[PDB]
Amino acid sequence: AITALLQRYPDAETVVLHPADVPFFVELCKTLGKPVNFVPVIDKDVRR
Amino acid sequence: XXXXXXXXXXXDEVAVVTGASKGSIAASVVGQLLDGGATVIATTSRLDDDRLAFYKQLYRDHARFDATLWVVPANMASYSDIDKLVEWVGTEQTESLGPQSIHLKDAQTPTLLFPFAAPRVAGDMSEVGSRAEMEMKVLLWAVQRLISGLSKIGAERDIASRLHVVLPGSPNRGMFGGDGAYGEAKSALDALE
Amino acid sequence: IDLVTAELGSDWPRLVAPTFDARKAVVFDDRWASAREDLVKLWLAEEX
Amino acid sequence: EIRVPRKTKLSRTVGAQIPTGFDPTVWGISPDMASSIDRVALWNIVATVDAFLSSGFTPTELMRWVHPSQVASTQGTGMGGMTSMQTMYHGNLLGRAKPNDILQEVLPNVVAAHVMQSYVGGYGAMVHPVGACATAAVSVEEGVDKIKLGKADLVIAGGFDDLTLEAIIGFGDMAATADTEMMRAKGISDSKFSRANDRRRLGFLEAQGGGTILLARGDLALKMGLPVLAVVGYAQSFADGVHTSIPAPGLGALGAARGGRESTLARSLAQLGVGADDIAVISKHDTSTLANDPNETELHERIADSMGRAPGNPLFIVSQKTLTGHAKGGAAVFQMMGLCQILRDGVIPPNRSLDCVDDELATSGHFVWVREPLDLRGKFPLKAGLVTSLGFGHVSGLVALVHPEAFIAALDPSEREDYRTRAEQRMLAGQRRL
Amino acid sequence: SVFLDKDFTFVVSSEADARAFVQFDPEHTVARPLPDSSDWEVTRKAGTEIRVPRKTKLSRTVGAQIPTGFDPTVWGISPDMASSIDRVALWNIVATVDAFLSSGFTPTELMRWVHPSQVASTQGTGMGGMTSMQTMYHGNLLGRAKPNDILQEVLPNVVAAHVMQSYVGGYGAMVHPVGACATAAVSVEEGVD
Amino acid sequence: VSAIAGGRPMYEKPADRRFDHDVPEKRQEAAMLLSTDARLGENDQYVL
Amino acid sequence: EMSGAADXXXXXXXXXXXXXXXXXXXXXXXXXXXXXXXXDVDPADLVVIVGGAELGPYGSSRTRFEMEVSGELSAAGVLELAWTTGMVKWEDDPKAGWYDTETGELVPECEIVERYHDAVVERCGIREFVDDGAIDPDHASPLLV
């Protein structure tokens, strides 16, 4: 699946995650059904 | 092409064409006139740059040697326009540079005249139903004054040159009932002859 | 002016307004300029 | 004696203005700076930051490779500090509260002085040309001059000017600016009224803004491993001469083409193994005035004619003033910027404001005026551009620009390959930072 | 700047100047044609903005000034030049002449040994054209008659531009440093360069 | 000392060398700027 | 029949959500043949342009070049101009994203062209002078006799 998508968009391999796509991912971690298995960000909520 | 260019010749025709707009019979006539090494006066009802850019596209394609094209804002419904236009068409062909820029009206005696100006039925102001009455001024009466206008210029400036006016007659009056416009209006062209 | 309008109608006076003026005319007498740009566009884009 | 308030109606209703809603604050300039400094300062300050962003960020990284006294600032102005000037002469005569720093802030050099205080912090050269309309190219000339003599190894070249009230009334009075009331009478929209080389060209549109470029020693650029945007093959300013006549335009920029194979223009090219035919593009000043356009054309026509430009191999010319308008001080830099972008992308920008080419210009056969963009792809390269600008009072200038890949040919295959490695890594890190 | 508390007494003005009055105030000012004289009356209502003349005393009573009685005319500068150009221009113009006088006189003698494009002018200013600048910003806001060449004459480069037009006539480089107080030495640097 | 006494040192030039013969010099205007070694003769008093 | 064919419409289902955005700017090399010697040219005597930028009626060098060469902005073109013109703002308040600065509304990258560019074109480039100085030269310029 990963190969299928990023073949269509080869530029995804050479570039940065968009600065507006970073809050989106961190936002998704907060609304996720089962809590995220990792730590996405070091911040005030790091204990949580 | 460089060799064929050296020996290239030209012709000359002076024409005034109205109703020359995009996707029309006259537009195909205009580019073809330009293809024949002519000098063409082209009138456009809409003066907007989208219409202006089109004639530039049409000219830069079909233009030959000796070919000169002229585009102007014009309204065939206005008698003032007709008088003012041909007063511009018939005066001098001179450009005076003083302290300022004055272009004296360009004088070219028309060979061919093409009254293809074709009002269309669009009634936004509610004008519906009175148009066939008004167009009779445009399609005939104002043409008559247009023919008379260029006749004056020709007589005043004294040319024996015959202006050839192609009268855009509608095909075969009376054997079609479905056109509703063309068939009836153009039968008086026999009376105009 | 009301009587004149009553006879002729609303659209007739408004559409009969003057348009043409001697200062808005545009003349294209240049082939020499347009032919040169026309050729180089052919020369570069030649495919057929 | 009493002075009683009145009003006036003026001819110029339109100008080329920085997009509405621009703030130096959004770019991150502190409010204290915005207050204390002229509007023109905000232009050169932000431009300098974005100019650095092309390669490096921290201005003190320059002090790693270079002793600080080898950092130079060459920044031109036609006037500069205009607001701060008009602020004093109103304010003082009006007794209104106005800033105490006024005369300091009206010095056309103080603007980049503010940038050196706030950003780079260099210990080295500061020069501030006045080229009228030609300062930008005149600035590049001296930026080039500072490096070759070892006075400074890194220079910032550029120009900037502002559009205010009394800037307009000076031009409109001088008759040099296009009269808007006449343009509307001819059915001309605001975007279409700046037309270079057009038969109908009515005089220039006044604009505002600023721009700068970072010029460096070729050896340093490789060593620092920054991007190479282009090689400046030459730069010159040129005067004209004694005459009474006011319309008579300066032709003195021809002095660069003097000598043929021995000419500065051709030798500059020849040192890269480039010929006279290999200049495809000239960036004209193209003021859209009736005086400048045909003269600059005759000028560029002649500089090609004597240097043995192959017959009918015309210089394809862009007019950026038809788009951006004419900003006096920052004129030739915007053209300088466009020329670099021309070389790397290959694309030659159109003049979309051209309805018809002036019939007078037909006599010039080494010149071609393009109304539509000619886009050069990977199979269709280009080589060298030329920026030309004519300032007021016989200020004329020429900057020969050449493609970066001409420089990479002097490294030998081993070091050439080594440089591409460094430049590639910088671009990736540069895209990151940006 | 003061706000008028009660309506000011009407004053006579021309139609062109009075229409202008309306363009600032218009809710706050009132203008009428006078039927007999065709001119207009200008009446400022309450709420208008008025600029009222005042004075100030300042600290600096002394400066270092060129000896009293100096004239560019005595040096031989034509009256037409004196008028058209800023005071700062008269300084650089005469200085350039006397600078040449140290060696040669006729500036075109340089064109004997040298191609004209090899003559350069590097001339610094901290501000320059100051008079011509203060002349516009007063004059325009004051509507006083002021010269049309103002912005050309306020360009700190225009002063030696005037010298190149009037004297040397060189075809070569022109640079014009701004060094604040240091322009002079900064200019030498680039002249050397 | 000749300049100081007479008011001589400032002479605003008519630019004789520019226009010296109306017809050719306007044509020679191009030719001058083009070729390197073209200069002033002294004997005619500085002719172009 | 043909008016009816024109009068009889229908809706073919189209489900589409489009967005606008791009990778960081790249460079397309050109094909150039060069016969050259290496050591001959002194790098210390050469002047090379490291970088450059501009502030003008069309925005920065990136957006201005797009308008000059193309004539229309890309995704990054409108995104940058809307940012410079101050149409779009960035809040760390909840919903964490790009917001419209005027009306205080959250915006994505797609609608930037639709919601803004029409107004951007008008208020950028060349236009009637917007008065930031409370004075209009063309309309009313203060005079004192």
The answer to whether residues D186 and D178 touch, using CB atoms and an 8 Å cutoff, is no
Q: How far apart are CA B164 and CA B13, in angstroms?
A: 11
The answer to whether G61 faces chain D, any CB pair under 8 Å, is yes
Interface test with chain F among D236, D238, D244, D261, by most F beta carbons within 10 Å: D244
Q: Which residue of chain D has the CA closest to B54?
A: D355
Are D306 and F35 in contact (CB < 8 Å)? Answer: yes
Place of tokens 């920054």: D226
Sign of the C-alpha dihedral, residues G109, G115, G118, G119? Answer: negative
Which residues of chain D have a CB within 8 Å of the CB of G81? 19
Among candidate residues D130, D98, D125, D100, the one with its CA nearest the CA of residue D113: D125
Strands laid side by side in the B164-165 sheet:
B164-165, B112-115, B14-18, B39-44, B68-73, C26-28
The pair of three-digit structure tokens given for residue E54, joined into one six-digit string: 């005042």
Are D355 and C26 in contact (CB < 8 Å)? Answer: yes
Q: What are phi and psi of D302, to 5 degrees?
A: -80, -40
Sequence-distant (≥ 6) Cβ neighbours of residue E145 within 8 angstroms:
E139
Q: Do chains E and C touch (3 or more CB pairs under 8 A)?
A: no
Count of CB contacts below 8 A, D vs E? Answer: 218
Give the CA angle between residues D129, D132, D133 to the nearest 5°: 110
Sequence-distant (≥ 6) Cβ neighbours of residue E134 within 8 angstroms:
D89
Which residues of chain D have a CB within 8 Å of the CB of F33? 251-252, 254-255, 258, 302
Which among D5, D232, D273 has the least Cβ separation from residue G34? D273
Are G53 and D373 in contact (CB < 8 Å)? Answer: no
The answer to whether residues F27 and E118 touch, using CB atoms and an 8 Å cutoff, is no
Pairing type for strands D230-238 and E121-122 reads unpaired
The answer to whether G74 faces chain D, any CB pair under 8 Å, is no
Q: What are phi and psi of D121, to 5 degrees?
A: 75, 25
D218: exposed, middle or buried (Cβ count in 10 Å: 0-12, 13-18, 19+): buried
Largest CA distance in chain B: 63
Q: How far apart are CA B79 and CA B85, in angstroms?
A: 10
The answer to whether G27 faces chain A, any CB pair under 8 Å, is no
Breaks (C-N over 2.5 A) in chain C follow: none
Using DSSP's 3-state secondary structure scheme, residue G122 falls into helix
The pair of three-digit structure tokens given for residue D267, joined into one six-digit string: 């030798």
Using DSSP's 3-state secondary structure scheme, residue D283 falls into strand
The answer to whether D431 faces chain A, any CB pair under 8 Å, is yes
Q: How far apart are CA D142 and CA E190, in angstroms?
A: 7
Are G23 and A14 in contact (CB < 8 Å)? Answer: yes
Interface test with chain C among B12, B44, B51, B75, by most C beta carbons within 10 Å: B75
Q: Give the number of C-alpha atoms closer than 13 A to the C-alpha of residue G116, restricted to the C-beta side.
A: 32
CA G58 centroid distance within chain = 8
Are G24 and A18 in contact (CB < 8 Å)? Answer: no
Are C37 and D362 in contact (CB < 8 Å)? Answer: no
Count of CB contacts below 8 A, E vs G? Answer: 18
Largest CA distance in chain C: 68
Are E23 and G144 in contact (CB < 8 Å)? Answer: no
Sequence-distant (≥ 6) Cβ neighbours of residue B193 within 8 angstroms:
B167
The runs of H, that is alpha helices, within chain F are 2-6, 16-19, 22-34
Sequence-distant (≥ 6) Cβ neighbours of residue D260 within 8 angstroms:
D266, D306, D307, D308, F36
C-beta contacts of E132-137 below 8 A and 24+ residues apart: E132/E85, E132/E86, E132/E88, E133/D85, E133/D89, E134/D89, E135/E86, E136/D166, E136/D169, E136/D170, E137/D85, E137/D86, E137/D89, E137/D90, E137/D166
The answer to whether residues D124 and D72 touch, using CB atoms and an 8 Å cutoff, is yes
Chains that touch D (3 or more CB pairs under 8 A): A, B, C, E, F, G
The answer to whether residues D303 and D257 touch, using CB atoms and an 8 Å cutoff, is yes
E21: exposed, middle or buried (Cβ count in 10 Å: 0-12, 13-18, 19+): buried
The answer to whether B159 faces chain C, any CB pair under 8 Å, is no
Q: How far apart are CA G63 and CA G74, in angstroms?
A: 9
CA D244 centroid distance within chain = 29
Are D192 and B47 in contact (CB < 8 Å)? Answer: no
How close, in Å, is residue E123 to chain D by CA atoms?
A: 9
- For residue D422, the surrounding DSSP H or E stretch is helix D412-433
Q: How far apart are CA F29 and CA F33, in angstroms?
A: 7
Sequence-distant (≥ 6) Cβ neighbours of residue D216 within 8 angstroms:
D147, D153, D154, D155, D224, D226, G47, G48, G49, G50
CA-based radius of gyration for chain D? 22
Sequence-distant (≥ 6) Cβ neighbours of residue D12 within 8 angstroms:
D168, D171, D172, D177, D179, D180, D206, G129, G137, G138
Q: How far apart are CA D284 and CA D354, in angstroms?
A: 15
Task: Give catalytic residues of D, as residue numbers.
Answer: 133, 285, 326
Report how far apart, in Å, the C-alpha atoms of E175 and of each of D73, D420, E111, E124, G89 are.
15, 37, 20, 8, 44
Pairing type for strands E29-33 and D154-161 reads unpaired
Q: How far apart are CA B171 and CA D376, in angstroms?
A: 52
Which residues of chain G have a CB within 8 Å of the CB of A16? 24
The pair of three-digit structure tokens given for residue C45, joined into one six-digit string: 């884009």
Q: How far apart are CA D399 and CA D338, in angstroms?
A: 13
CA D319 centroid distance within chain = 12
- Side chain identity at D92, as an amino acid letter? N
Q: How far apart are CA E168 and CA E105, in angstroms?
A: 10
Sign of the C-alpha dihedral, residues D377, D378, D380, D381? Answer: positive
Among candidate residues D65, D76, D163, D60, the one with its CA nearest the CA of residue D116: D60
How close, in Å, is residue B101 to chain D by CA atoms?
A: 11
Using DSSP's 3-state secondary structure scheme, residue B43 falls into strand
Are E56 and D95 in contact (CB < 8 Å)? Answer: yes
Q: What are phi and psi of E16, to 5 degrees?
A: -70, -40
CA D118 centroid distance within chain = 24
Are D298 and F34 in contact (CB < 8 Å)? Answer: no
Q: Do chains D and B touch (3 or more CB pairs under 8 A)?
A: yes
The answer to whether residues D139 and D129 touch, using CB atoms and an 8 Å cutoff, is yes
Among candidate residues D211, D209, D179, the one with its CA nearest the CA of residue D82: D209
Strands laid side by side in the G47-55 sheet:
D126-127, D71-77, D154-161, D209-217, G47-55, D230-238, D395-402, D384-391, D279-283, D315-318, D367-369
How close, in Å, is residue C43 to chain B by CA atoms?
A: 13
Among candidate residues D169, D206, D285, the one with its CA nearest the CA of residue E149: D169
The answer to whether residues D403 and D281 touch, using CB atoms and an 8 Å cutoff, is no
The answer to whether C42 faces chain B, any CB pair under 8 Å, is no
How close, in Å, is residue D171 to chain E by CA atoms?
A: 7
Report how far apart, in Å, the C-alpha atoms of D423 and of each of A12, B21, D369 are.
22, 55, 35
Which residues of chain F have a CB within 8 Å of the CB of D244? 14-15
Q: Do chains C and B touch (3 or more CB pairs under 8 A)?
A: yes
Q: Give the number of C-alpha atoms closer than 13 A to the C-alpha of residue E76, restricted to the C-beta side.
A: 17
Q: Which residues of D touch F (CB under 8 A)?
A: 241-244, 251-252, 254-255, 257-260, 262, 298, 302, 305-306
Count of CB contacts below 8 A, D vs F? Answer: 30
Q: How far apart are CA D149 and CA D108, in angstroms?
A: 25
Q: Which of residues 101-120 of G touch D (CB under 8 A)?
A: 120
CB atoms under 10 Å from CB of B90, counted, come to 21
The answer to whether G38 faces chain D, any CB pair under 8 Å, is yes
The pair of three-digit structure tokens given for residue E77, joined into one six-digit string: 């500068």
Pairing type for strands D384-391 and D395-402 reads antiparallel
Using DSSP's 3-state secondary structure scheme, residue D205 falls into coil
- Side chain identity at D391, as an amino acid letter? G
Q: Do chains G and C touch (3 or more CB pairs under 8 A)?
A: no
3-state helix, strand, coil split of chain F in percent (to 5) is: 45, 5, 50
The answer to whether G98 faces chain A, any CB pair under 8 Å, is yes
CA E13 centroid distance within chain = 29
Which residues of chain D have a CB within 8 Å of the CB of F18? 241-243
CA E22 centroid distance within chain = 30
The technique by which this structure was obtained is cryo-EM
Q: How far apart are CA D316 and CA D282, in angstroms?
A: 6
Which residues of chain G have a CB within 8 Å of the CB of E23? 139-140
Among candidate residues D401, D282, D389, D268, the one with its CA nearest the CA of residue D343: D401
Report how far apart, in Å, the C-alpha atoms of D420 and of each of D55, D423, F35, G28, G129 are.
15, 5, 42, 14, 47
CA-based radius of gyration for chain C? 24
- Side chain identity at E75, as an amino acid letter? W
The answer to whether residues D219 and D175 touch, using CB atoms and an 8 Å cutoff, is no
Are E24 and G144 in contact (CB < 8 Å)? Answer: no
How close, in Å, is residue C37 to chain D by CA atoms?
A: 7
The pair of three-digit structure tokens given for residue B193, joined into one six-digit string: 């002859």
How close, in Å, is residue A18 to chain G by CA atoms?
A: 9
The runs of H, that is alpha helices, within D95-193 are 102-105, 110-115, 135-148, 165-174, 180-185
CA D79 centroid distance within chain = 15
Resolution of this PDB entry, in A? 7.5
